[PDB]
Design a protein around this nucleic acid. Structure first.
Ligand code: RFP
Ligand code: ZN
Lengths: 176, 96, 1126, 49, 195
DNA sequence: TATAATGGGAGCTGTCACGGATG
DNA sequence: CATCCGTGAGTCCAG
């Protein structure tokens, strides 16, 4: 009891709960039972009906049973070629795409200018340029020294003013 | 981050040096979860110990914005900095 | 004619009449073996005709070694018999298509015997799906054609070595007993005249210690080994005496740490060397030891184990060979030659084919399930035990699956051209499990041994670090049922050559005396001269009277392999260039249409047919209907067979396997005839290249250092043009954010880019594709992360809401291009069985019609390689008198250094073959053309000829044939008797000052084309750990600037260049990004930072309990973009 | 100990260097290339730099 | 010989106690990465199974001590723990190596530094570089000594961010993002730009 | 998780040249 | 001067 429990709990490099192991073992059991019965490895549709009657899960189970492989392991022909040397760091930052973002900042800096100080005010407020957060509009008008929510009034006084650098298409390029 | 430093010294590491390095003791052999595919707590990839998987994204998800910087969420104790830290943050194991 | 057997085009042969025996089934090395494994009908008959008494199949053997399986009680007994297959689960073509393994299910009959209850339950058990071999001698594992290479191993047995002492300078004799599997045992002789033994590499002890341990009296030691003073000196210096004291002594030295009982030392000495469980000489292991000692030589092979008689007879062999004795009779055994054994002799060097390699892996899987069987017996109750409960076949199916998937002997099939595959099947490797490592191999293993004659080629071997370790099997050789390499020899009774032929193994040939194949023979069969050329043991040669001639070689071309024999005038090229020339024919590429060479050696016919990449008729008949799609043949008996043509199929190596029908409708065709041929084949012949008009001269430096110059005719007429197909794949999986879906709708893409797709999202058949374009439009749901506050703003202005689907489409890789010649869609929806998690899987097959270009590698058969330097306009070409431009200009300088003047002789014979000739019969038949067979005294224009290796044309005849060259259509001779011709420089107009050697030569287009070899990268993907650029053209990687490459920088003193390459160009995480910016902004390059890979190091030292600190000038530990905390 | 470790017997070098507390003055070719500094030779010397 | 060791611990206030460990450092996860491949299967470093090996036996030691097991069982675990930490720092050093699947010996910590493929001679003394390429060479008698024929296709990728620059200069492309798309699509303009 | 059950199992085979610790 | 264990044994490419 202690072995089989400690076996199911420790052997997996990625830990699966006890019942999940009970399942896969039942699956391998019913497989070997249907193995000698059909002279062929049984279809997923066949295996499913006998034990859990659900085909989608059996597929899912058979992937759980799949044991991972080592990065440090190599290819047989030459002892220099290890697997990890082929794994592309998907995390790492693309040079051009990050630089292009930087050039997008220089275009919005040429937008904070044509816009007024009131106009370039609510812009960096609800969008959160210097902040990093999008504050609720009923808090933005009250945190700012102009009232009668005239800051929402200035909003529409900008939406069309932004159409001109949009009609200059200098912002149109950076969306595609 | 100036490039010019004069000397590179090597020594025999104290057991106390080991604990001064580490941001926490690994107590579980578990790597990740089998469903969530997330670093399980107090494990080999625990985000409380080594850091966040995604930039400024806290483990429990209570903090998911760049606005919180250097904030230690109370529900899972994960500092919010880049996943760039998981290449520099150490751990340790306390042998009995 | 040469091979007037199948119905082949006439290729006339300069020759001495070769009628010993036709080239054996070249694929029989693979075929015959697998037939023994499964025990096919054709094998049992083949065992009968060979007169093999009581044949046992490869699978039959494993079951008998196994059967029966009993527990310690003897209560239970499980046993297997009668293995049988069903029909194959799916046809070969379907397996290649659906990526499933070509196999037929194996069944066995198993019964559970019980001695207590006396009852027996017997039933049939399923053993799994068994990988079957094709007709072409290949396996198909998961839809990729594979090949099992034969392994050259060290045969089991007892070997004797003579080593010379450094100090005493006396001859010391050592023995080593090698089991198929088990413990070690080596008797050696000191300089102290005292015999010693090392068991499994334990310390040395006196050998008498072992004799008194066996039970032999101290008096019998004096009797048997008394004739020497070195054994009397051994029994005298003997430490202790007594049967008990010896066993204890041996035990104490074998396994220290364990309590020595008189009953525990007697036992393991029995088990380590005399039990089938721990120790085992194979059938060869028994047979080889016996021959060496000459006992039970007549008695059939029943013993699989070592005996005491073997031990004693071995030591007797050691002592006699030490004191100078030359021969010895073992008491109860026939007389045996006594000497030291060469481990590299092909009588001691063994060849294990496909059958044994699979059998061994089968044996591994059986002993595993046997462990489970013996566990499942003690568990369950006796009454409810069936074989179905005891048997777990899961380890068996995993042992055979793993082998074909992992082992260094299940190889991707070399599928450049039909020859490339053929040579892959006949390879002999020393590498692989059970064999030796590449470092472990010294220089003796690799060089050419005398016993290689007729068995393994001495020319065909890799140039690289693998040299000598891999070879090709010879043409006429075959493998005997014991894993050794036989070879055919003609039998000479008494100076008279008989057509009776016997195959001899290596050591069997050593006891005999063989005559070279070209020794002159009477029309009856008697020798001409008394003293003839004779081959003898130890590669030694001497003249010997014809009374003593035992056998003679079958053919002059007996020593060579299949690829080697296809090199005209081989005997004129030094081994080095000849070597490459054999390794390079394998590298040729199939061209749009192929021509048979003007010059051949006769090996071009049988090679193409045996390759199995042409279409051969099974039964005679008449072509009832022919299409480009298929040929239908009407047999004489009334039945109809139809052969489907392979059309534009992608090989393993991207070359184009395309079969075209040869026969026209209504043609009468006989059985075994080539009715349709494939890639690199012209009328059922190996056509690896094209016949080109050569010109041997330096031309304006463009051909300097082995470069080549081409005529544009070869590009305008597709003479050197090939088709290359690629296979692009992509699938739609289930993700955590939903599931990937293949659609025509891709985010932020015009209808101009999507124009070449259909409504599905797939490219349309016949459309053309360039790199970067879209093949299969697939989108995936992207993680709902807070989008950029700077892009949120950008989406409010233009009012365009963001989609949650990111582009994950299959675009064409850099460098690829061509036409889309077919789509293969698999849907989980349409019940197509996919792996768990996949929905739609698409394959797109793009073909490129590549013309030849600069940088492409051309090569002749004589190791004369070289890349295309310049393709001149057709008019620039140095041309002959009649205005015909030459095709290829080879540099003169690169001929007399390489010793391959065979390329020249081919050119001479190449012109003769193209122009034709006619010997002068007036005033009789000339004295030079006196050995010339009648058929060659007159030749047509564009005639094909044979020049068999170590035979064929002689330099006398060739000089003469240059004189006979027929004039062109304008009634003018073009070349002289020197083989040269006057040329006009196509550029200046003036004729060249000196006659230039001109003629035809067979050039091959190797698979080293620039389109594949060219590569470059600005920025791209980076390594995960080291953060350095990835590696390989396939990964869009950068070049490596190695340790050697840095030394060159340092020597120069270019510190900044060097620094840049190792910093901002490589793994400076922040640096590379900022260098990109400074370049596109036209600014200055920034000062490099800290290599992220150096940062990695300090974390790797730290993790090893090495307190490493970086200190500033003051003495304080500084931070490396990181901090410390507890 | 950096130049030595990148040469041969890397494990032997480090065990010794750790014990002897050997401080490395990064003033050499081998030493400098590893850390990414300008090599103390050619254009890298302060005379020209 | 003995002094050469003992005098070294004398001089620097570098205690010999360090040769015995009470706590073992754990290397950062991204340096012992665990990655999911396109085949669904996961790929992990060898270190993760060696670290896993230590903690499993180290924690089993904790349970055994706490239960008050006999010394025979407790001592066994300690030996196991010893070999575990050993095989982590240097595998194969003492006794037979720790095998994973395929009887393959696992890479240890020190195995990351040793010899050719090690972190020193493979990743520091020689690196891979950006802005670089490779191709077949061919004689060019037409060239002067200081010249070379660099393939048009090659140069465009080498000088890619150099050309994007001049594309947005001469107004062929409105921005840097489009300029990339003109080079990738290999529009006829760029060949005039590259020269 | 109550019939009784009590000490493992594959080795791995063809190097080579050298210094340092031991003889 | 001779044994036993540990450490060396060309580079780049593809794969
Ligand atoms: C699974 O087997 C692998 C090795 C195991 O390991 C190992 C130790 O045992 C090997 C055996 C038993 C071999 O018989 C062999 C071999 O015959 C060979 C090369 C040549 N190796 N070079 C290759 C790279 N290169 C720049 C340097 C050296 C090998 O390395 C090996 C080889 C080994 O290396 N070649 C030749 O003899 C001749 C002269 C030309 C080659 C023909 C083509 C090209 C190949 O056959 C292609 C079609 C593939 O089939 C192989 C590539 C296999 O790859 C796969 C996955 O299928 C590979 C043999
Ligand atoms: Zn949280």
């Amino acid at each position: 009891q202690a072995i089989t429990r400690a076996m199911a709990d420790q052997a997996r490099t990625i830990r699966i709960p006890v019942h999940m192991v009970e399942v896969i073992n039942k699956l391998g059991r019913i497989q070997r039972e249907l193995l000698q019965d059909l002279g062929r490895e049984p279809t997923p549709e066949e295996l499913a009906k006998e034990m859990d009657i659900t085909p989608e899960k059996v597929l899912e189970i058979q992937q759980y049973a799949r044991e991972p492989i080592s990065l440090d392991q190599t290819i047989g022909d030459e002892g220099d070629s290890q697997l990890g040397d082929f794994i592309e760091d998907s995390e790492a930052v693309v040079a051009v795409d990050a630089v292009s973002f930087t050039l997008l900042q220089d275009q919005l800096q040429s937008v904070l200018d044509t816009l007024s100080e009131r106009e370039a005010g609510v812009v960096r407020l609800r969008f959160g340029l210097t902040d990093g957060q999008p504050r609720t509009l009923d808090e933005i008008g009250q945190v700012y020294g102009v009232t009668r929510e005239r800051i929402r009034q200035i909003e529409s006084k900008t939406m069309s003013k932004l159409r001109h650098p949009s009609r200059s298409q200098v912002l149109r390029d950076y969306l595609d | 981050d100036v490039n010019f430093f004069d000397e590179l010294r090597i020594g025999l590491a104290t057991a106390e040096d080991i604990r001064q390095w580490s941001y926490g003791e690994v107590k579980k052999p578990e790597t990740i979860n089998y469903r969530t595919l997330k670093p399980e707590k107090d494990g080999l990839f625990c985000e409380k110990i080594f850091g966040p998987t995604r930039d400024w994204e806290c483990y429990c998800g209570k903090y998911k914005r760049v606005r919180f910087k250097g904030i230690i969420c109370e529900r899972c104790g994960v500092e919010v900095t880049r996943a760039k830290v998981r290449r520099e943050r150490m751990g340790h194991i306390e042998l009995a | 004619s040469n091979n007037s057997v199948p119905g082949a085009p006439n290729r006339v042969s300069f020759a001495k009449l070769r009628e010993p025996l036709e080239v054996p089934g070249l694929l029989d090395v693979q075929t015959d073996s697998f037939e023994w494994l499964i025990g096919s009908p054709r094998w049992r008959e083949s065992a009968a005709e060979r007169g093999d008494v009581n044949p046992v199949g490869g699978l039959e053997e494993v079951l008998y070694e196994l059967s029966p399986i009993e527990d310690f009680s003897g209560s239970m007994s499980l046993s297997f018999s009668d293995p049988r297959f069903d029909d194959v689960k799916a046809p070969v073509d379907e397996c290649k298509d659906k990526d499933m393994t070509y196999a037929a299910p194996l069944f066995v009959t198993a019964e559970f015997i019980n001695n207590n209850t006396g009852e027996i339950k017997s039933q049939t058990v399923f053993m799994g799906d068994f990988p079957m071999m094709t007709e072409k001698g290949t396996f198909i594992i998961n839809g990729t054609e594979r090949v099992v290479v034969s392994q050259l191993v060290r045969s089991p047995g007892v070997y004797f070595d003579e080593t010379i002492d450094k100090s005493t300078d006396k001859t010391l004799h050592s023995v080593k007993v090698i089991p198929s599997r088990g413990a070690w045992l080596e008797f050696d002789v000191d300089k102290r005249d005292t015999v010693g033994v090392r068991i499994d590499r334990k310390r040395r002890q006196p050998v008498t210690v072992l004799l008194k341990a066996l039970g032999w009296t101290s008096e019998q030691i004096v009797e048997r080994f008394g004739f020497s003073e070195i054994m009397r000196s051994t029994l005298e210096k003997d430490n202790t005496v007594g049967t008990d004291e010896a066993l204890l002594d041996i035990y104490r030295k074998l396994r220290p740490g364990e309590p020595p009982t008189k009953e525990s030392a007697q036992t393991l000495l029995e088990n380590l060397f005399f039990k089938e469980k721990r120790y085992d000489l194979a059938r060869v292991g028994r047979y080889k030891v016996n021959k060496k000692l000459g006992l039970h030589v007549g008695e059939p092979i029943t013993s699989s184990t070592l005996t005491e008689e073997d031990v004693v007879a071995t030591i007797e062999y050691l002592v006699r060979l030490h004191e100078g004795q030359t021969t010895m009779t073992v008491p109860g055994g026939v007389e045996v030659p006594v000497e030291t054994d060469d481990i590299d002799h092909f009588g001691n060097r063994r060849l294990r084919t496909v059958g044994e390699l699979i059998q061994n892996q089968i044996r591994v899987g059986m002993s595993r399930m046997e462990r489970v069987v013996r566990e499942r017996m003690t568990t369950q109750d006796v009454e409810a035990i069936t074989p179905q409960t005891l048997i777990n076949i899961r380890p068996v199916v995993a042992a055979i699956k793993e082998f074909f998937g992992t082992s260094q002997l299940s190889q991707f099939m070399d599928q450049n051209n039909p020859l490339s595959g053929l040579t892959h099947k006949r390879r002999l490797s020393a590498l692989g499990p059970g064999g030796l490592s590449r470092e472990r191999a010294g220089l003796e293993v690799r060089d050419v041994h005398p016993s290689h004659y007729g068995r393994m080629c001495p020319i065909e071997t890799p140039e690289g670090p693998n040299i000598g370790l891999i070879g090709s099997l010879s043409v006429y050789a075959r493998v005997n049922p014991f894993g050794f390499i036989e070879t055919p020899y003609r039998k000479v009774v008494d100076g008279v050559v008989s057509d009776e032929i016997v195959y001899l193994t290596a050591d069997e040939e050593d006891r005999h005396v063989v005559a070279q194949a070209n020794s002159p023979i009477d029309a009856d069969g008697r020798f001409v001269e008394p003293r003839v050329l004779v081959r003898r043991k130890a590669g030694e040669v001497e003249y010997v009277p014809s009374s003593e001639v035992d056998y003679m070689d079958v053919s002059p071309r007996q020593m060579v392999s299949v690829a080697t024999a296809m090199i005209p005038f081989l005997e004129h090229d030094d081994a080095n260039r000849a070597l490459m020339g054999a390794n390079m024919q394998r590298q040729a590429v199939p061209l749009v249409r192929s021509e048979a060479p003007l010059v051949g050696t006769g090996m071009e016919l049988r090679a193409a047919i045996d390759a199995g990449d042409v279409v051969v008729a099974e039964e005679s008949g008449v072509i009832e209907e022919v299409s480009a799609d298929y040929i239908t043949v009407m047999h004489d008996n009334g039945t109809r067979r139809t052969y489907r043509m392979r059309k534009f199929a992608r090989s393993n190596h991207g070359t184009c396997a395309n079969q075209c029908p040869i026969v026209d409708a209504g043609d009468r065709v006989e059985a075994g005839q080539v009715i349709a041929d494939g890639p690199c084949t012209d009328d059922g012949e190996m056509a690896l290249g094209k016949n080109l008009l050569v010109a041997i001269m330096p031309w304006e430096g463009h051909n300097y250092e082995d470069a080549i110059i081409l005529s544009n005719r070869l590009v305008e007429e597709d003479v050197l043009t090939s088709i290359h197909i690629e296979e692009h794949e992509i699938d739609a999986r289930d993700t955590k954010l939903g599931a990937e879906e293949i659609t025509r709708d891709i985010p932020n893409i015009s209808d101009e880019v999507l124009a070449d797709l259909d409504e599905r999202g797939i490219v349309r058949i016949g459309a053309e594709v360039r790199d970067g374009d879209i093949l299969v439009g697939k989108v995936t749901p992207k993680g709902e992360t807070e989008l950029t506050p700077e892009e949120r703003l950008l989406r409010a202005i233009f009012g365009e809401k963001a989609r949650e689907v990111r582009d994950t489409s299959l675009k064409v890789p850099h460098g690829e291009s061509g036409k889309v010649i077919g789509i293969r869609v698999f849907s989980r929806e349409d019940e197509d069985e996919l792996p768990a998690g996949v929905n739609e899987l698409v394959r797109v097959y793009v073909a490129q019609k590549r013309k030849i270009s600069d940088g492409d590698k051309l090569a002749g058969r004589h190791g004369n390689k070289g890349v295309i330097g310049k393709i001149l306009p057709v008019e620039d070409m140095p041309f002959l008198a009649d205005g015909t431009p030459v095709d290829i200009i080879l540099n003169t300088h690169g001929v007399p250094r390489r010793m391959n003047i065979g390329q020249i002789l081919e050119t001479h014979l190449g012109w003769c073959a193209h122009s034709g000739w006619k010997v002068d019969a007036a005033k009789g038949v000339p004295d030079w053309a006196a050995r010339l067979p009648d058929e060659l005294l007159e030749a047509q224009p564009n005639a094909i000829v044979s020049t068999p290796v170590f035979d064929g044309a002689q330099e006398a005849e060739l000089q003469g044939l240059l004189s006979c060259t027929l004039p062109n259509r304008d009634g003018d001779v073009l070349v002289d008797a020197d083989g040269k011709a006057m040329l006009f420089d196509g550029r200046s107009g003036e004729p060249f000052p000196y006659p230039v050697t001109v003629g035809y030569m067979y050039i091959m287009k190797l698979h080293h084309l620039v389109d594949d070899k060219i590569h470059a990268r600005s920025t791209g993907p980076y390594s995960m750990i080291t953060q350095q650029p990835l590696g390989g053209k396939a990964q869009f990687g950068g070049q490596r600037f190695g340790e050697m490459e840095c030394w060159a920088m340092q020597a120069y003193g270019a510190a900044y260049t060097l620094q840049e390459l190792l910093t901002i160009k490589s793994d400076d995480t922040v640096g590379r990004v900022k260098v990109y910016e400074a370049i596109v902004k036209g600014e200055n390059i920034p000062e490099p930072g800290i290599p992220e890979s150096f940062k990695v190091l300090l974390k790797e030292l730290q993790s090893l309990c090495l307190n490493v600190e970086v200190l500033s000038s003051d003495g304080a530990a500084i931070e490396l973009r990181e901090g410390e905390d507890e | 100990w950096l130049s030595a470790a990148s040469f041969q017997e890397t494990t032997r070098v480090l065990t010794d260097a750790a014990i002897n507390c050997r401080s490395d003055k990064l003033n050499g070719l081998k030493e400098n290339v590893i850390i990414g500094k300008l090599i103390p030779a050619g254009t890298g010397i302060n005379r020209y730099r | 010989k003995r002094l050469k060791v003992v005098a070294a611990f004398q001089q620097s206030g570098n205690s010999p106690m360090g040769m015995v460990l009470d706590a073992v450092p754990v290397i950062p996860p991204e340096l012992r990465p665990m990655v999911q491949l396109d085949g669904g299967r996961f790929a992990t470093s060898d270190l993760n199974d060696l670290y896993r090996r230590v903690i499993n036996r180290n924690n089993r030691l904790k349970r055994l001590i706490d239960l008050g097991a006999p010394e025979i069982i407790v001592n066994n675990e300690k030996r196991m723990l010893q070999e575990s930490v050993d095989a982590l720092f240097d595998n194969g050093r003492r006794g037979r190596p720790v095998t994973g699947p395929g009887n393959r010996p696992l890479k240890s910590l020190s195995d990351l530094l040793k010899g050719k493929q090690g972190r020193f001679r493979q990743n520091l003394l020689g690196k891979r570089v950006d802005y670089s390429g490779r191709s077949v060479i061919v004689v060019g008698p037409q060239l002067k000594l200081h010249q070379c024929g660099l393939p048009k296709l090659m140069a465009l990728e080498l000088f890619k961010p150099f050309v994007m620059k001049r594309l947005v200069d001469l107004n062929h492309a409105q921005n840097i993002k489009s300029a990339k798309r003109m080079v990738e699509r290999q529009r006829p303009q760029v060949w005039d730009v590259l020269e």
